[PDB]
Amino acid sequence: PEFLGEEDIPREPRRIVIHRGSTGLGFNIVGTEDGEGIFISFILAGGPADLSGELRKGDQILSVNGVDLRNASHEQAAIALKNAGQTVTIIAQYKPEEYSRFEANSRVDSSGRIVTD
Amino acid sequence: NYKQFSV
């Protein structure tokens, strides 16, 4: 048996296109007023982000529709995403170590996966 | 510094 859980999660940036018409994207972001990164904290089962099958908790949102979000505040990133239109092109990059700082009792294992105790 | 938003 060949388990996915054993192999490394790619750390390279990826392009994800979410086609959502006029509904929510189906995920939550965490960030700071400082601009220390915008990260996916939660993906809604059955929502557009989930249906893409290409985003996960711990992804940093680098940009939306060409708009650089690496140094965005949580609020301005929210605005950008809500107003991104029906077709939303996200560049994301898996950053579990940076993400783990936000969530209590969380850490990264050898596979690169986020674990909460 | 922290906040969380649904989108």
Side-chain angles (χ1 to χ4, degrees), chain A residues 20-32 34-54:
Chain A
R20 52 116 174 220
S22 293
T23 195
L25 292 167
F27 67 91
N28 281 263
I29 56 165
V30 296
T32 62
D34 323 20
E36 276 134 79
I38 301 297
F39 305 89
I40 298 181
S41 59
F42 173 97
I43 298 177
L44 178 64
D50 181 26
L51 299 177
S52 91
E54 297 163 39

PDB file of all heavy atoms in Angstrom, chain A residues 20-54, unseen atoms left out:
ATOM      1  N   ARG A  20     -16.147  30.755  -8.982  1.00  0.00           N
ATOM      2  CA  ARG A  20     -17.143  30.795  -7.911  1.00  0.00           C
ATOM      3  C   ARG A  20     -18.378  31.642  -8.199  1.00  0.00           C
ATOM      4  O   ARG A  20     -19.211  31.811  -7.318  1.00  0.00           O
ATOM      5  CB  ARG A  20     -16.495  31.312  -6.628  1.00  0.00           C
ATOM      6  CG  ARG A  20     -15.741  32.622  -6.800  1.00  0.00           C
ATOM      7  CD  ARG A  20     -16.365  33.740  -5.995  1.00  0.00           C
ATOM      8  NE  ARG A  20     -15.550  34.954  -6.053  1.00  0.00           N
ATOM      9  CZ  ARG A  20     -15.326  35.770  -5.025  1.00  0.00           C
ATOM     10  NH1 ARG A  20     -15.856  35.527  -3.832  1.00  0.00           N
ATOM     11  NH2 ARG A  20     -14.563  36.839  -5.193  1.00  0.00           N
ATOM     12  N   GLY A  21     -18.505  32.174  -9.411  1.00  0.00           N
ATOM     13  CA  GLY A  21     -19.633  33.038  -9.728  1.00  0.00           C
ATOM     14  C   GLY A  21     -19.805  34.157  -8.712  1.00  0.00           C
ATOM     15  O   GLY A  21     -18.909  34.981  -8.535  1.00  0.00           O
ATOM     16  N   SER A  22     -20.954  34.187  -8.039  1.00  0.00           N
ATOM     17  CA  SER A  22     -21.215  35.195  -7.013  1.00  0.00           C
ATOM     18  C   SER A  22     -21.524  34.552  -5.662  1.00  0.00           C
ATOM     19  O   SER A  22     -22.510  34.896  -5.011  1.00  0.00           O
ATOM     20  CB  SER A  22     -22.373  36.105  -7.435  1.00  0.00           C
ATOM     21  OG  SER A  22     -22.015  36.898  -8.554  1.00  0.00           O
ATOM     22  N   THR A  23     -20.676  33.616  -5.247  1.00  0.00           N
ATOM     23  CA  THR A  23     -20.771  33.028  -3.912  1.00  0.00           C
ATOM     24  C   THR A  23     -19.419  33.153  -3.217  1.00  0.00           C
ATOM     25  O   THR A  23     -18.434  33.530  -3.845  1.00  0.00           O
ATOM     26  CB  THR A  23     -21.205  31.544  -3.963  1.00  0.00           C
ATOM     27  OG1 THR A  23     -21.621  31.116  -2.660  1.00  0.00           O
ATOM     28  CG2 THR A  23     -20.071  30.640  -4.455  1.00  0.00           C
ATOM     29  N   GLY A  24     -19.379  32.848  -1.924  1.00  0.00           N
ATOM     30  CA  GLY A  24     -18.138  32.873  -1.170  1.00  0.00           C
ATOM     31  C   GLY A  24     -17.122  31.857  -1.664  1.00  0.00           C
ATOM     32  O   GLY A  24     -17.479  30.877  -2.311  1.00  0.00           O
ATOM     33  N   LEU A  25     -15.852  32.091  -1.351  1.00  0.00           N
ATOM     34  CA  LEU A  25     -14.773  31.199  -1.765  1.00  0.00           C
ATOM     35  C   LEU A  25     -14.668  29.929  -0.918  1.00  0.00           C
ATOM     36  O   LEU A  25     -14.079  28.941  -1.349  1.00  0.00           O
ATOM     37  CB  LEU A  25     -13.443  31.948  -1.723  1.00  0.00           C
ATOM     38  CG  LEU A  25     -13.301  33.056  -2.768  1.00  0.00           C
ATOM     39  CD1 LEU A  25     -12.112  33.945  -2.456  1.00  0.00           C
ATOM     40  CD2 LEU A  25     -13.165  32.443  -4.152  1.00  0.00           C
ATOM     41  N   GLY A  26     -15.219  29.966   0.291  1.00  0.00           N
ATOM     42  CA  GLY A  26     -15.254  28.793   1.143  1.00  0.00           C
ATOM     43  C   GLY A  26     -13.965  28.500   1.896  1.00  0.00           C
ATOM     44  O   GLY A  26     -13.598  27.339   2.085  1.00  0.00           O
ATOM     45  N   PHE A  27     -13.265  29.542   2.329  1.00  0.00           N
ATOM     46  CA  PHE A  27     -12.139  29.339   3.232  1.00  0.00           C
ATOM     47  C   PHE A  27     -11.887  30.577   4.065  1.00  0.00           C
ATOM     48  O   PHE A  27     -12.376  31.663   3.757  1.00  0.00           O
ATOM     49  CB  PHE A  27     -10.871  28.925   2.469  1.00  0.00           C
ATOM     50  CG  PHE A  27     -10.285  29.989   1.573  1.00  0.00           C
ATOM     51  CD1 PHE A  27      -9.327  30.865   2.053  1.00  0.00           C
ATOM     52  CD2 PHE A  27     -10.646  30.072   0.238  1.00  0.00           C
ATOM     53  CE1 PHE A  27      -8.763  31.825   1.228  1.00  0.00           C
ATOM     54  CE2 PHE A  27     -10.079  31.032  -0.592  1.00  0.00           C
ATOM     55  CZ  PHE A  27      -9.144  31.905  -0.097  1.00  0.00           C
ATOM     56  N   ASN A  28     -11.147  30.389   5.150  1.00  0.00           N
ATOM     57  CA  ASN A  28     -10.832  31.471   6.066  1.00  0.00           C
ATOM     58  C   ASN A  28      -9.343  31.745   6.049  1.00  0.00           C
ATOM     59  O   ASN A  28      -8.544  30.849   5.784  1.00  0.00           O
ATOM     60  CB  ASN A  28     -11.286  31.131   7.480  1.00  0.00           C
ATOM     61  CG  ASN A  28     -12.768  31.329   7.664  1.00  0.00           C
ATOM     62  OD1 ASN A  28     -13.211  32.368   8.147  1.00  0.00           O
ATOM     63  ND2 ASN A  28     -13.548  30.343   7.256  1.00  0.00           N
ATOM     64  N   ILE A  29      -8.986  32.995   6.328  1.00  0.00           N
ATOM     65  CA  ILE A  29      -7.597  33.411   6.369  1.00  0.00           C
ATOM     66  C   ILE A  29      -7.275  33.985   7.732  1.00  0.00           C
ATOM     67  O   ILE A  29      -8.132  34.590   8.381  1.00  0.00           O
ATOM     68  CB  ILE A  29      -7.285  34.451   5.280  1.00  0.00           C
ATOM     69  CG1 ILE A  29      -8.230  35.652   5.407  1.00  0.00           C
ATOM     70  CG2 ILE A  29      -7.389  33.820   3.906  1.00  0.00           C
ATOM     71  CD1 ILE A  29      -7.786  36.865   4.630  1.00  0.00           C
ATOM     72  N   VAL A  30      -6.026  33.805   8.147  1.00  0.00           N
ATOM     73  CA  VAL A  30      -5.497  34.475   9.316  1.00  0.00           C
ATOM     74  C   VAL A  30      -4.348  35.368   8.880  1.00  0.00           C
ATOM     75  O   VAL A  30      -3.632  35.064   7.924  1.00  0.00           O
ATOM     76  CB  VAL A  30      -5.036  33.472  10.392  1.00  0.00           C
ATOM     77  CG1 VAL A  30      -6.216  32.668  10.903  1.00  0.00           C
ATOM     78  CG2 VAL A  30      -3.955  32.558   9.846  1.00  0.00           C
ATOM     79  N   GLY A  31      -4.181  36.478   9.581  1.00  0.00           N
ATOM     80  CA  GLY A  31      -3.061  37.361   9.342  1.00  0.00           C
ATOM     81  C   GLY A  31      -2.935  38.368  10.456  1.00  0.00           C
ATOM     82  O   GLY A  31      -3.598  38.246  11.485  1.00  0.00           O
ATOM     83  N   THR A  32      -2.081  39.363  10.245  1.00  0.00           N
ATOM     84  CA  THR A  32      -1.849  40.397  11.241  1.00  0.00           C
ATOM     85  C   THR A  32      -2.079  41.767  10.620  1.00  0.00           C
ATOM     86  O   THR A  32      -2.198  41.886   9.401  1.00  0.00           O
ATOM     87  CB  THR A  32      -0.422  40.320  11.807  1.00  0.00           C
ATOM     88  OG1 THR A  32       0.522  40.536  10.751  1.00  0.00           O
ATOM     89  CG2 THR A  32      -0.168  38.956  12.439  1.00  0.00           C
ATOM     90  N   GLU A  33      -2.147  42.799  11.455  1.00  0.00           N
ATOM     91  CA  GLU A  33      -2.269  44.162  10.952  1.00  0.00           C
ATOM     92  C   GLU A  33      -0.921  44.539  10.344  1.00  0.00           C
ATOM     93  O   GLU A  33      -0.842  45.343   9.415  1.00  0.00           O
ATOM     94  CB  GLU A  33      -2.672  45.153  12.057  1.00  0.00           C
ATOM     95  N   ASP A  34       0.134  43.930  10.881  1.00  0.00           N
ATOM     96  CA  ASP A  34       1.498  44.119  10.405  1.00  0.00           C
ATOM     97  C   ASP A  34       1.827  43.666   9.040  1.00  0.00           C
ATOM     98  O   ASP A  34       2.818  44.061   8.512  1.00  0.00           O
ATOM     99  CB  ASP A  34       2.510  43.426  11.316  1.00  0.00           C
ATOM    100  CG  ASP A  34       2.149  43.494  12.731  1.00  0.00           C
ATOM    101  OD1 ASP A  34       0.967  43.723  13.026  1.00  0.00           O
ATOM    102  OD2 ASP A  34       3.048  43.309  13.570  1.00  0.00           O
ATOM    103  N   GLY A  35       1.068  42.746   8.486  1.00  0.00           N
ATOM    104  CA  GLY A  35       1.446  42.204   7.193  1.00  0.00           C
ATOM    105  C   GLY A  35       2.470  41.094   7.149  1.00  0.00           C
ATOM    106  O   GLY A  35       3.283  41.072   6.298  1.00  0.00           O
ATOM    107  N   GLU A  36       2.398  40.169   8.065  1.00  0.00           N
ATOM    108  CA  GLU A  36       3.404  39.149   8.212  1.00  0.00           C
ATOM    109  C   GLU A  36       3.058  37.888   7.398  1.00  0.00           C
ATOM    110  O   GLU A  36       3.604  36.840   7.623  1.00  0.00           O
ATOM    111  CB  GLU A  36       3.511  38.744   9.675  1.00  0.00           C
ATOM    112  CG  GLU A  36       4.396  39.578  10.599  1.00  0.00           C
ATOM    113  CD  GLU A  36       3.699  39.892  11.919  1.00  0.00           C
ATOM    114  OE1 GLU A  36       3.624  39.048  12.849  1.00  0.00           O
ATOM    115  OE2 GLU A  36       3.189  41.001  12.028  1.00  0.00           O
ATOM    116  N   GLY A  37       2.101  38.021   6.482  1.00  0.00           N
ATOM    117  CA  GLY A  37       1.620  36.887   5.713  1.00  0.00           C
ATOM    118  C   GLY A  37       0.140  36.621   5.906  1.00  0.00           C
ATOM    119  O   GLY A  37      -0.400  36.821   6.995  1.00  0.00           O
ATOM    120  N   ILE A  38      -0.513  36.176   4.835  1.00  0.00           N
ATOM    121  CA  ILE A  38      -1.914  35.769   4.865  1.00  0.00           C
ATOM    122  C   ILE A  38      -1.961  34.265   4.652  1.00  0.00           C
ATOM    123  O   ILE A  38      -1.476  33.773   3.633  1.00  0.00           O
ATOM    124  CB  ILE A  38      -2.741  36.514   3.782  1.00  0.00           C
ATOM    125  CG1 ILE A  38      -2.666  38.030   3.987  1.00  0.00           C
ATOM    126  CG2 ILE A  38      -4.192  36.039   3.772  1.00  0.00           C
ATOM    127  CD1 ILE A  38      -3.253  38.524   5.306  1.00  0.00           C
ATOM    128  N   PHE A  39      -2.542  33.535   5.603  1.00  0.00           N
ATOM    129  CA  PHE A  39      -2.544  32.071   5.552  1.00  0.00           C
ATOM    130  C   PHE A  39      -3.949  31.487   5.618  1.00  0.00           C
ATOM    131  O   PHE A  39      -4.827  32.041   6.277  1.00  0.00           O
ATOM    132  CB  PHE A  39      -1.710  31.500   6.702  1.00  0.00           C
ATOM    133  CG  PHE A  39      -0.310  32.032   6.753  1.00  0.00           C
ATOM    134  CD1 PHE A  39      -0.017  33.183   7.466  1.00  0.00           C
ATOM    135  CD2 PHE A  39       0.715  31.385   6.084  1.00  0.00           C
ATOM    136  CE1 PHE A  39       1.275  33.684   7.512  1.00  0.00           C
ATOM    137  CE2 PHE A  39       2.008  31.883   6.124  1.00  0.00           C
ATOM    138  CZ  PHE A  39       2.288  33.032   6.838  1.00  0.00           C
ATOM    139  N   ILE A  40      -4.150  30.368   4.930  1.00  0.00           N
ATOM    140  CA  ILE A  40      -5.417  29.637   4.997  1.00  0.00           C
ATOM    141  C   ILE A  40      -5.476  28.849   6.300  1.00  0.00           C
ATOM    142  O   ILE A  40      -4.595  28.047   6.587  1.00  0.00           O
ATOM    143  CB  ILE A  40      -5.588  28.701   3.790  1.00  0.00           C
ATOM    144  CG1 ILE A  40      -5.630  29.508   2.487  1.00  0.00           C
ATOM    145  CG2 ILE A  40      -6.848  27.842   3.953  1.00  0.00           C
ATOM    146  CD1 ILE A  40      -5.825  28.659   1.228  1.00  0.00           C
ATOM    147  N   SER A  41      -6.529  29.071   7.080  1.00  0.00           N
ATOM    148  CA  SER A  41      -6.681  28.408   8.372  1.00  0.00           C
ATOM    149  C   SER A  41      -7.723  27.301   8.336  1.00  0.00           C
ATOM    150  O   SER A  41      -7.722  26.402   9.174  1.00  0.00           O
ATOM    151  CB  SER A  41      -7.076  29.423   9.438  1.00  0.00           C
ATOM    152  OG  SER A  41      -8.299  30.042   9.080  1.00  0.00           O
ATOM    153  N   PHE A  42      -8.626  27.379   7.370  1.00  0.00           N
ATOM    154  CA  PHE A  42      -9.804  26.524   7.364  1.00  0.00           C
ATOM    155  C   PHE A  42     -10.371  26.485   5.957  1.00  0.00           C
ATOM    156  O   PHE A  42     -10.506  27.525   5.313  1.00  0.00           O
ATOM    157  CB  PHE A  42     -10.841  27.046   8.370  1.00  0.00           C
ATOM    158  CG  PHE A  42     -12.171  26.332   8.327  1.00  0.00           C
ATOM    159  CD1 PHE A  42     -12.456  25.312   9.221  1.00  0.00           C
ATOM    160  CD2 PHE A  42     -13.151  26.709   7.419  1.00  0.00           C
ATOM    161  CE1 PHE A  42     -13.682  24.664   9.192  1.00  0.00           C
ATOM    162  CE2 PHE A  42     -14.381  26.063   7.385  1.00  0.00           C
ATOM    163  CZ  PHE A  42     -14.645  25.042   8.276  1.00  0.00           C
ATOM    164  N   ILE A  43     -10.702  25.291   5.483  1.00  0.00           N
ATOM    165  CA  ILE A  43     -11.375  25.144   4.201  1.00  0.00           C
ATOM    166  C   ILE A  43     -12.697  24.440   4.426  1.00  0.00           C
ATOM    167  O   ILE A  43     -12.749  23.367   5.024  1.00  0.00           O
ATOM    168  CB  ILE A  43     -10.493  24.399   3.201  1.00  0.00           C
ATOM    169  CG1 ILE A  43      -9.221  25.216   2.951  1.00  0.00           C
ATOM    170  CG2 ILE A  43     -11.250  24.146   1.897  1.00  0.00           C
ATOM    171  CD1 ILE A  43      -8.234  24.565   2.038  1.00  0.00           C
ATOM    172  N   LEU A  44     -13.762  25.065   3.935  1.00  0.00           N
ATOM    173  CA  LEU A  44     -15.118  24.569   4.119  1.00  0.00           C
ATOM    174  C   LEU A  44     -15.385  23.359   3.239  1.00  0.00           C
ATOM    175  O   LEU A  44     -15.190  23.410   2.032  1.00  0.00           O
ATOM    176  CB  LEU A  44     -16.127  25.670   3.803  1.00  0.00           C
ATOM    177  CG  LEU A  44     -17.603  25.291   3.911  1.00  0.00           C
ATOM    178  CD1 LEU A  44     -17.979  24.940   5.346  1.00  0.00           C
ATOM    179  CD2 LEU A  44     -18.462  26.426   3.379  1.00  0.00           C
ATOM    180  N   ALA A  45     -15.844  22.272   3.847  1.00  0.00           N
ATOM    181  CA  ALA A  45     -16.228  21.088   3.090  1.00  0.00           C
ATOM    182  C   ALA A  45     -17.307  21.443   2.073  1.00  0.00           C
ATOM    183  O   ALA A  45     -18.346  21.992   2.431  1.00  0.00           O
ATOM    184  CB  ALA A  45     -16.722  19.987   4.028  1.00  0.00           C
ATOM    185  N   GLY A  46     -17.046  21.141   0.805  1.00  0.00           N
ATOM    186  CA  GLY A  46     -18.024  21.352  -0.245  1.00  0.00           C
ATOM    187  C   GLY A  46     -18.069  22.745  -0.846  1.00  0.00           C
ATOM    188  O   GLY A  46     -18.807  22.982  -1.804  1.00  0.00           O
ATOM    189  N   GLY A  47     -17.290  23.670  -0.290  1.00  0.00           N
ATOM    190  CA  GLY A  47     -17.225  25.024  -0.815  1.00  0.00           C
ATOM    191  C   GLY A  47     -16.316  25.088  -2.030  1.00  0.00           C
ATOM    192  O   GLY A  47     -15.654  24.110  -2.347  1.00  0.00           O
ATOM    193  N   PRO A  48     -16.291  26.236  -2.726  1.00  0.00           N
ATOM    194  CA  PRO A  48     -15.490  26.337  -3.954  1.00  0.00           C
ATOM    195  C   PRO A  48     -14.004  26.012  -3.782  1.00  0.00           C
ATOM    196  O   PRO A  48     -13.428  25.359  -4.656  1.00  0.00           O
ATOM    197  CB  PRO A  48     -15.686  27.800  -4.364  1.00  0.00           C
ATOM    198  CG  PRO A  48     -17.047  28.123  -3.871  1.00  0.00           C
ATOM    199  CD  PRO A  48     -17.142  27.425  -2.539  1.00  0.00           C
ATOM    200  N   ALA A  49     -13.386  26.453  -2.690  1.00  0.00           N
ATOM    201  CA  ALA A  49     -11.968  26.161  -2.476  1.00  0.00           C
ATOM    202  C   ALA A  49     -11.749  24.654  -2.357  1.00  0.00           C
ATOM    203  O   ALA A  49     -10.772  24.110  -2.870  1.00  0.00           O
ATOM    204  CB  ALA A  49     -11.454  26.867  -1.240  1.00  0.00           C
ATOM    205  N   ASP A  50     -12.670  23.983  -1.679  1.00  0.00           N
ATOM    206  CA  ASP A  50     -12.578  22.540  -1.502  1.00  0.00           C
ATOM    207  C   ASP A  50     -12.743  21.828  -2.842  1.00  0.00           C
ATOM    208  O   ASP A  50     -12.031  20.866  -3.144  1.00  0.00           O
ATOM    209  CB  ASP A  50     -13.636  22.062  -0.507  1.00  0.00           C
ATOM    210  CG  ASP A  50     -13.580  20.571  -0.267  1.00  0.00           C
ATOM    211  OD1 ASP A  50     -12.492  19.981  -0.436  1.00  0.00           O
ATOM    212  OD2 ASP A  50     -14.621  19.994   0.096  1.00  0.00           O
ATOM    213  N   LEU A  51     -13.684  22.310  -3.646  1.00  0.00           N
ATOM    214  CA  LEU A  51     -13.978  21.686  -4.931  1.00  0.00           C
ATOM    215  C   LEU A  51     -12.803  21.838  -5.893  1.00  0.00           C
ATOM    216  O   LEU A  51     -12.627  21.014  -6.787  1.00  0.00           O
ATOM    217  CB  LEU A  51     -15.252  22.281  -5.536  1.00  0.00           C
ATOM    218  CG  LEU A  51     -16.522  22.096  -4.697  1.00  0.00           C
ATOM    219  CD1 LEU A  51     -17.712  22.789  -5.346  1.00  0.00           C
ATOM    220  CD2 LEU A  51     -16.829  20.629  -4.462  1.00  0.00           C
ATOM    221  N   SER A  52     -11.985  22.872  -5.703  1.00  0.00           N
ATOM    222  CA  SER A  52     -10.767  23.022  -6.500  1.00  0.00           C
ATOM    223  C   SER A  52      -9.809  21.870  -6.217  1.00  0.00           C
ATOM    224  O   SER A  52      -9.112  21.394  -7.113  1.00  0.00           O
ATOM    225  CB  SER A  52     -10.068  24.350  -6.208  1.00  0.00           C
ATOM    226  OG  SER A  52      -9.108  24.209  -5.166  1.00  0.00           O
ATOM    227  N   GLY A  53      -9.779  21.429  -4.962  1.00  0.00           N
ATOM    228  CA  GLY A  53      -8.890  20.361  -4.540  1.00  0.00           C
ATOM    229  C   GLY A  53      -7.418  20.725  -4.611  1.00  0.00           C
ATOM    230  O   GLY A  53      -6.567  19.839  -4.704  1.00  0.00           O
ATOM    231  N   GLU A  54      -7.111  22.020  -4.551  1.00  0.00           N
ATOM    232  CA  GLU A  54      -5.734  22.484  -4.745  1.00  0.00           C
ATOM    233  C   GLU A  54      -5.229  23.451  -3.672  1.00  0.00           C
ATOM    234  O   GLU A  54      -4.127  23.990  -3.794  1.00  0.00           O
ATOM    235  CB  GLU A  54      -5.609  23.154  -6.111  1.00  0.00           C
ATOM    236  CG  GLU A  54      -5.865  22.207  -7.280  1.00  0.00           C
ATOM    237  CD  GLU A  54      -6.154  22.938  -8.581  1.00  0.00           C
ATOM    238  OE1 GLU A  54      -5.506  23.975  -8.847  1.00  0.00           O
ATOM    239  OE2 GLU A  54      -7.035  22.476  -9.339  1.00  0.00           O
TER     240      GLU A  54
END
